[model samples]
Target: EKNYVMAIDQGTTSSRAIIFDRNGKKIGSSQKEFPQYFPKSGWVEHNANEIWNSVQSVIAGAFIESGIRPEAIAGIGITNQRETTVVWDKTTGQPIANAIVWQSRQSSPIADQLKVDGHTEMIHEKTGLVIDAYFSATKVRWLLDNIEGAQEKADNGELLFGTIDSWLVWKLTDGQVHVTDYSNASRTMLYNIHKLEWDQEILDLLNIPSSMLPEVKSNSEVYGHTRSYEFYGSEVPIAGMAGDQQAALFGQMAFEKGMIKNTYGTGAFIVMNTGEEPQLSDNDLLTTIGYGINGKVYYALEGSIFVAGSAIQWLRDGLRMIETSPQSEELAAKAKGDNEVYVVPAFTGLGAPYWDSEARGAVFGLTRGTTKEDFVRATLQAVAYQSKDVIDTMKKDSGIDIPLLKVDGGAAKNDLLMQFQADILDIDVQRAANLETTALGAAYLAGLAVGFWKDLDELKSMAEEGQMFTPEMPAEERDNLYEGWKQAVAATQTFKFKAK
Candidate 1:
């Protein structure tokens, strides 16, 4: 009588659990935000224990809130932030150092060295990822080289390395399983997408031992069962998995080739399904595994934007301009459109087609008459412009003319932002009834695996209708607006601070 599916969505700043019924309707949800540590400039870390605790608390809270019996749950699915690296002791199950967040730039020096050594092309060809600190490879190498005794343990095959997905799967199985899906594996820069195995050449070059790696598996399959004790009294199968962006793409039921979904959370990630065969990007876009299920691997072309909603957050916390993140939408409506202003909120750096990690945020075209509303509006516009940067590259790299962009995430609720996105891209922008597709996607996968849903068609039918914002701005007007964004970005790239 199993009738429900549960999803654990472990994200950059928090852990969330959502329960969905067979009809793809969300029943209940729970979320817990955890602290992000910044030990030094451009360095970010998270306490592994806090992450686990949040997952445990939120899962319990979700079950209690939904009033759903654990025994009635079909299975548990996991979708997580990819490439955030962790290395832990095999025997003790304790992380040796903090989990190096994907946003952490501590390993930039290492990545730069690799790129300078003429290794970038090879790495990209093998892993279908760029040589950047954002991926797991350099971060893993950093830990092994810097941590006392870490290299010795890694060389001896005593340590286990994983992205957040592997870490969660291992922890959920009570260390009984150490595995990750193709979607998450592809982001590590260590796994070969074409061969479906860890690239030993990359491993040898990076000096990462093969023994410490997890077994890569298909996205939709019985990964492992949750250890009995952790679930109080129920033993639910951990049935499906994917990285967050891939899960969103799947949740949209973008099963066909050329389907695309852009998820804007702490950052923005755009992924377009490239069908079965891998299509290499000529424009610095990443070619990665969209998902692997039933012996079929779906390839994807991706563009990463480091800051999206986080820029909105900066408006609230750093600038104190908005009361809540959503306030930006309302204020943006009031902003004078004729007043030229652009806020390139690249607080971390530019991502995707730009990939300039050294660039900082900047604001341009401000005047004495500029108001708070104008500033907030400009901030949201920056996100739209950044998104265009991703979508444009995805179109050029794939040569698939995208007519519209499917959008998800917290910020997708903002109508003003969606309209701006549509105007900027000169295409329609669609937002689902529930913008929280990350958790919904996980739930869908788990349900599908256990037959809570009959087939992909049934699941697709259950997906709610979305609101579409069509391009309304005149062509020349839109061009002028976009030109302003490009000028502002150029100015921001030049606004450098002398590193202390």
Candidate 2:
């Protein structure tokens, strides 16, 4: 009896396949990290074929871990890192080049010229994304122009373009399907979120062939089926897919309008469910499709804190201040400084609402007596403060006053940081009972599509009780402290030139 739904969670750094039963609890899972390539100063890449192999390896790993037969799985769902580009030949099924990762800025020249051509507002209006190398539009053009005769190959309809989600499904189905869900498609900068199709105007502007694009589909449906040979000799329907953050939103069960979820991963992604109509943000927050289901689409206002857990990791690896991630929280409680130190971690420049790509990291209000605890505590506070900036802007733009914030990821276990986060935002912060909401989100999507779970209410009934952290700081104290953070960010932006 096919009673379980399997979710293949493909992330930025790793691939994980998790098996979920009817109660939304994971029965078994396996995760494996892959390599990242940096060929130049700012380039980040991954071997498309290697990543696909990693996915297959994890699938087998999960099966062994759970002892679940392939025929016991009802459907397969996928949620992946958004905007990583891959182009492959249909006949041979080999990638033309290493997949250009979402974090790579190698397409900056192409993106820069788009801004110079005065098409920013038009593209933003149609696609609900800012013109930048972060999206798939430029990355697609970069591959064709750089790879020598690649453009001719694409022009002749020999190449098929897909994101990590499309690539995995194509491989699992043995090249029978090439498609992307609305949540992933919205991040591509080529899809018109409003019209629900790939924009031909923008495609023409970037000189990308429309034929290479994947067919856009809703978040929950039977996109295709896995081939028997590829699936341990049993064909199964591949049903649901979404981008990781959006998947987290659905997993968090923010079904109603105004519900917000923040994932504190290597970088923090704050997303708010803005209901059916797409609401464009006046600020730098991106408007993206949260998830589409039952013939309806839900939109989200998302703001990314570029440096979250990575800043804490820097302390361990770069500065050698601590040994492990959990040590920072314990060390922070022993802070000797007067809580005046501020560390603006713009390692890759500030993201969301600030949009300062050239800004560098800086520290302010530091004294000679500052201990490792003080610096570590200050760095952790930066993560919370950056999130406050996004929530404030999200409320103003969407007119949704968030009463509570739901959080997950590696850093969510830190009680000190959770309390600090609540005090800093002056709002209640709730941690999920299940920390792997990202993976569970895909499982929910898959389960819903296959009737493993009846509906939203059935999913809600199975949820576990979560711990809540409420605001404890005085109004005068928190406000004055946040004021100092605002001042530090402005100062951090003033210095742009680097020493060669």
Candidate 3:
């Protein structure tokens, strides 16, 4: 008779479903990777129907794999990639065009024009985000202007704009609920984090209709119930929703002020909880809603690095240097210590502290004697070095002394990378016992809302203490290596690619 909770984690590359028991332990889970589209060099897209179908498959797979009954599920929670734009027809639930992915630069001209119009300061003051294509505001504008009849349909209230979270929620409830959590809302660049509402001035500037927006809600609450058809004839309560990074922050149980956690996925995101009030960054960091629970709102300072684990993917697919990602770690361990090679992976441009969108990837200090092992090692080292870039800036902006850093995600599993990260930052790095903390965080929120768990204290006790990686390299060597990384970055920025 024990109730269970299900977490649907829709990420940049895959759709995952995880079922958890009362103790916060994952009972079973399934993940399915979908196709990615790139029509142009910097454009990225996803088919909405494919994402929806993948979500359905994962849910069924999770229950079947665990042999759990649908009736046993007490609630459902959702976590998704933030800032990916999707506009669909309200009547048919079909997307008018492919989803404009968060990583796409197709909306760059729109953001550039906004800056030229001299609304940069007003936008930063209102939305806590800079004028960049990395957000959703410009993406929405591009869709309205480019798609045929999209603007007319939006003006007539025939279409709706949503991030992946809102899209999934609408489908799950059979179009009964059209709402999003504050964590997801704050990422849109249209929502004012300070006022806790959608900004009309910015919306008008972008020419987006107010009717197309979803109602904003707190992170932990019952938004609506899933339809019987979606949940195997059991109408489960859909209780919690949050962006993936914020969900990971909650999952790590870093509920206190001054606590910090970094997620190393396709991109590296470093977030620090700054307590109840929003802390505006003077340094280039973003101010975002950490999570809203129990009628209280918490804020965070975020630093984004556009490339992390993707560098490894480039090694596997682009260079054919290695057969698999794990092989990079093994080869890195065998690399010569005296090699001075460094890989500055600014593939899609740099982010955080240095927001240069034109910088491309480069390598430095390569010599005639450099081997494949050294090159692979340098690639893995870039991941740690880029994280150091954000951590240094975050410390400067927040003025908080971070004694230890908590980490989760796929890249955190690499022992060599974690140790290198600790050595480079000169701090302790702790990896979560469950790498799927994003999904766990979503499950915790839903469980709390539906009485499956008692409160935060109980949830904290259920979370396992993870492994820790401490600095082992000498202090002088660490400084020298980091100094080389800085010069490598500067050198990488010097060369620019111009299309003829």
Candidate 4:
């Protein structure tokens, strides 16, 4: 009988389960997407029960597909979309309302009130996060205040607040555990990253009771065991939990400071490991915990691009210019060099360095002679350009010269985009052999905890090396293209809608 590790990758749009053998090679996997709710213009939400069911379905699917017995599984690891808020009844195990997604703007007023109250610096000093609705603090506050009598229930310790990770853990353990890792906890504006506990001042500012908060733990520890009934009559250690990006950072084996990884998914997240101590960013980049392991914590500097592969998604679904996402790469390759069109994808506001929440998407330099190929090509180029905006700010804030960038996610498979990304940043871009590093990272952490893998050295030796993309374009041409991107962004920001 062969032992295996199972990783539950609970993402924004879908839930996935991946099984890995001893050498970190993926043996089988299953994924199921759930419905997204847009109740209002800017509000986004998910049914907590639907997400939980998706996880259960994928786990059984993966095992059936791989012919791996439940008893043969050594442990389970979970990685989730960070900062998506869920508050539920401790006794009934039912959510008070739909989970507030990370992208929703329903809590914007709460965040704005905090800024008005002059709690911005105080909050950042303790939590290392800016005053924004993208985090969990305001969302948690909104639920308590909006859901009738919810605050009173919370004050009585009848309610429990959690990000997706904590929610999943509680469900898996049959509510025997209620905990969150440092990586996920840091995303909640309520946690004091420096003090390693929930901040009372922030709780008071938001008027949230501390009793509803989950216990904070390291990223790679046994929080609890899966209920035997839930795991096909076998109890396995639930040992690893991390927010998706930090898991990718660990999966990339970026142990040294200054090492960076960029995940180009629906949105792009660029995170650099800044070593043991947190390096506060002066340029609006977020300071966060990378991971906590071996009784030590690693810190990171993160820059977010609100659009990446989703721009290509728009080309397929919104514009109908391409039949599929992969077709955009082929069509883009057909574009002529003389075409200079630029697409600024600020469809849902800009993130990091700029933080312009009102900006909308725009296109520039369009000509009568421009073909659909040029239009699609420019759309892909926008992803690379937005990434450069963050990379430039990261360099300025950290003063660390990023020698190379480790890349992952679906879009990284497009060779043309990778080449353009390398040329624009003038740095080498290395893609991972397993593009699903998010799941791999979770498996690595779980396997380590259960003694299935010896140590980091052994895990690193097992990870496969990948293709590299180096700077190929001339320096002068690269700089000129980037300048046009800056000009286009400036023009886009200048044209916001004025209220009547």
lDDT of 3 at 495: 86
Clashes of each: 0, 0, 0, 0
- Candidate 1 ranges with C-alpha deviation above 4 Å: 337-339, 494-500
Candidate number with greatest lDDT? 3
Poorest stretch of ten by lDDT in candidate 3: 278-287
- What overall lDDT, based on C-alpha atoms, would model 4 receive against the true structure? 0.89
**TM-score: which candidate is best?**
3
**Cα lDDT listed for each candidate:** 0.87, 0.89, 0.90, 0.89
How does model 1 score by TM-score? 0.96
Q: Per-residue alpha-carbon lDDT of model 1 for 317-351, expressed as tens digits? A: 87797999887788988987574898887767788
The order by descending lDDT is 3, 4, 2, 1
In the predicted model 4, the residue pairs found to clash are none
Q: How does residue 199 of candidate 3 score in lDDT?
A: 99
lDDT by residue (tens digit), candidate 3, 385-448: 8778888888888787788999999888988789889998999999999998999999988988
Error of 2 at 279 (Å): 2.0
Candidate 4's displacement at residue 115, Å, is 1.8
Per-residue CA lDDT of candidate 4, range 87-107, in tens?
Answer: 999999999999999878899
TM agreement with the true structure for every prediction: 0.96, 0.95, 0.97, 0.96
Steric clash pairs (candidate 1): none
